[PDB]
């Protein structure tokens, strides 16, 4: 199988500012027709792929002339001459010369902006869930950037673990920040055992971590 | 326009079989082939086989080597992928797309119209509505609503009816490992606001048929 | 080049009704078990056999229901390639009449139609007055008008003459010129000048 290797797998791109994206195949994707075999194809967040290139250099009907492909042999490269908000999403480069098809793992980009640290929130179970016999406790952190952030939770002081599950939204395409949402479960029965909930949050906007709490029974 | 209309979402136990259907308009079915290509949660894009719609010709990938037969129907314009001996690692959006050249002959274009996807989640899990809970505080202030333990995917959360989006973050759901999903939508508005206004969160999740609006206090 | 030619490679292809045009598909391929297939998407295909060539079609004594789009499709090492031709009928007779038949001084205008003709669109159906091989100054067009007698056309085209001075012309020439993609014919009629 042709392995087909991009990098970077990760883009942090300032609005107006140029992009390129490498895809290396471990063999040529010159056909004996003559034709070169490289495909490129975007994924926006909850959206279908859609072709974005087609043989290294041509622009599929709609694609702006910011995008340009290039390359030949093994070694290919896509490039952005500027990233638009609409532009963020997961690249794709593809061989069609020898089955089966392959993709690299695809490149994320992203809009780089200033970094924004993180408006930080925790909800307590509401009583309806604890007659279920379990206890969600939810720790928001809104609109920050970079999504790289960290969300720790204490309950009485102690580290959880295995037992907390969080998402990331995707890249606000006004502000370009992110949103975390992360969820601690525990029986009503062990959550009836401690008093201190807590969620301790780091990150680049912050100086020091930040930590949100309430005691379960105030 | 060049459409591919796919069927619904699935849910299947591990072990059992699937057939996706592609229905094809706004071009000549027989003119292209039809690749299918998956993708895992949270993954790459991966070609699963292919069917050459005019000759009844076919190419498997290793994974569905074995267990998987793409065929084409012409007389409903109409593609297939039957994937038997269904693996949790076969939890995939599907996607079919149809393959071609120019009009010509001229240029290669491969995969330039796509399906929207098929969701097919390999699961033992039953069919469950959710349970809506108040995320609520012990000049900006958060609230939402938890949706919990619903299976399949997907649910809807809308705030007011549509009228309040600005703010909204409705998060992407996790999967719980009691094999039930778990979703968050939160607003943050400013915080007198938070007691004179009204926010209530309307949840709906059809696979169980399940409206559900919760004002949150 | 692509795995799948055409001969002719031309999107859109000419031929006279009752006339045939013969179009062959080929596929290069390096893998056996490769095969290609000519298809009707617009009308009925016609009559293709497998060996000489590679895919020979053979359109027929075309009639205008001959006309048409049509495309070969083929597949190589997983990809699928198409070519598509489109095939035009055409009526164009060496029936062209004159009217009058011949002139008299003191005629006002002459009048040339193309019978049993089509298409009859004006970029391609066009008329001329000529005298000594160059069109005749001075003559003013009526404008085209379009008639019937598969259904064809009568298109008549009617001039007011000029002054035609001395010495009269031994005769001018009503020329109808028949353009398509590939094509041009042109058929002259004589009109005595009496």
């Known amino acids: 199988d042709i392995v087909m290797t991009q990098t970077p797998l990760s883009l942090s791109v300032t609005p107006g500012q140029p992009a390129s994206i490498s895809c290396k195949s471990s063999q040529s994707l010159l056909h004996t027709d003559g034709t070169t075999y490289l495909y490129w194809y975007l994924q926006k967040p909850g959206q279908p792929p859609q072709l974005l290139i087609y043989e290294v250099s041509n622009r599929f009907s709609g694609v702006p002339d910011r995008f340009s492909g290039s390359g030949s042999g093994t070694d290919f490269t896509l490039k952005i001459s500027r990233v638009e908000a609409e532009d963020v999403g997961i690249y794709y480069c593809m061989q069609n010369i020898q089955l089966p098809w392959t993709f690299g793992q695809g490149t994320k980009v992203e809009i780089k902006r200033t970094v924004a640290a993180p408006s930080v929130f925790i909800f307590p179970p509401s009583d309806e869930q604890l007659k279920s016999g379990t206890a969600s406790v939810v720790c928001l952190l809104n609109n920050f950037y970079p999504r790289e952030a960290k969300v720790q939770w204490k309950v009485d002081n102690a580290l959880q673990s295995g037992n907390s599950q969080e998402s990331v939204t995707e890249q606000d395409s006004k502000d370009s920040t992110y949103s975390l949402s992360s969820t601690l479960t525990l029986s009503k029965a062990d959550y009836e055992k401690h008093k201190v909930y807590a969620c301790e949050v780091t990150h680049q906007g912050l100086s020091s971590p930040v930590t949100k709490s309430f005691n379960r029974g105030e | 326009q060049v459409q591919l209309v796919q069927s619904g979402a699935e849910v299947k136990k591990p072990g059992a079989s699937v057939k996706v259907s592609c229905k094809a308009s706004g071009y000549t079915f027989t003119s292209y082939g039809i690749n299918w290509v998956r993708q895992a949660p949270g993954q790459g894009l991966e070609w699963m086989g292919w069917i050459s719609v005019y000759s009844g010709n076919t190419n498997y990938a290793q994974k569905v080597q074995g267990r998987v037969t793409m065929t084409a129907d012409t007389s409903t314009s109409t593609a297939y992928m039957d994937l038997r001996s269904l693996r949790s690692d076969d939890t995939a959006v599907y996607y079919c797309a149809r393959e071609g050249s120019s009009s010509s002959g001229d240029y290669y274009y491969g995969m330039d119209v796509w399906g929207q996807g098929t969701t097919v989640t390999v699961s033992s899990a039953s069919t469950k509505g959710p349970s809506v809970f108040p995320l609520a505080p012990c000049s900006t202030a958060a609230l939402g609503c938890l949706v919990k333990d619903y299976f399949p995917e997907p649910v809807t959360v809308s705030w007011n009816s549509g009228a309040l989006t600005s703010g909204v973050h409705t998060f ?41 609006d919760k004002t949150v206090e | 080049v692509k795995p799948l030619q055409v001969e002719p490679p031309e999107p859109v292809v000419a031929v006279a009704l009752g006339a045939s045009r013969q179009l062959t598909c080929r596929l290069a391929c390096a893998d056996r078990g490769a095969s290609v297939q000519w298809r009707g998407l617009d009308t009925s295909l016609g009559a293709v056999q497998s060996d000489t060539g590679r895919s020979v079609l053979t359109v027929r004594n075309a009639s205008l229901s001959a006309a048409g789009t049509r495309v070969c499709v083929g597949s190589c090492g997983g990809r699928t390639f198409q070519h598509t031709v489109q095939l035009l009928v055409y009526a164009f007779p060496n029936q062209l009449t004159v009217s009058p038949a011949a002139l008299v001084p003191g005629d006002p205008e002459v009048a040339c139609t193309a019978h049993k003709v089509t298409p009859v669109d004006p970029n391609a159906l066009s008329f001329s007055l000529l005298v000594g091989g160059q069109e005749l100054e001075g003559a003013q067009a009526l404008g085209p008008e379009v008639q019937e007698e598969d259904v064809l056309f009568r298109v008549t085209e009617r001039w007011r003459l000029p002054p035609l001075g001395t010495p009269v012309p031994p005769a001018l020439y009503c020329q109808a010129t028949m353009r398509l993609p590939g094509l041009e014919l042109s058929h002259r009629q004589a009109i005595p000048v009496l």
């Open chain 2, 172 to 212: 992407p759901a996790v999967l719980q490992s009691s094999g039930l999903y778990s979703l968050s939508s939160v607003v943050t508005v400013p915080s007198s606001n938070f007691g004179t206004q009204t926010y209530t969160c309307n949840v709906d999740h059809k696979p169980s048929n399940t409206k559900v």
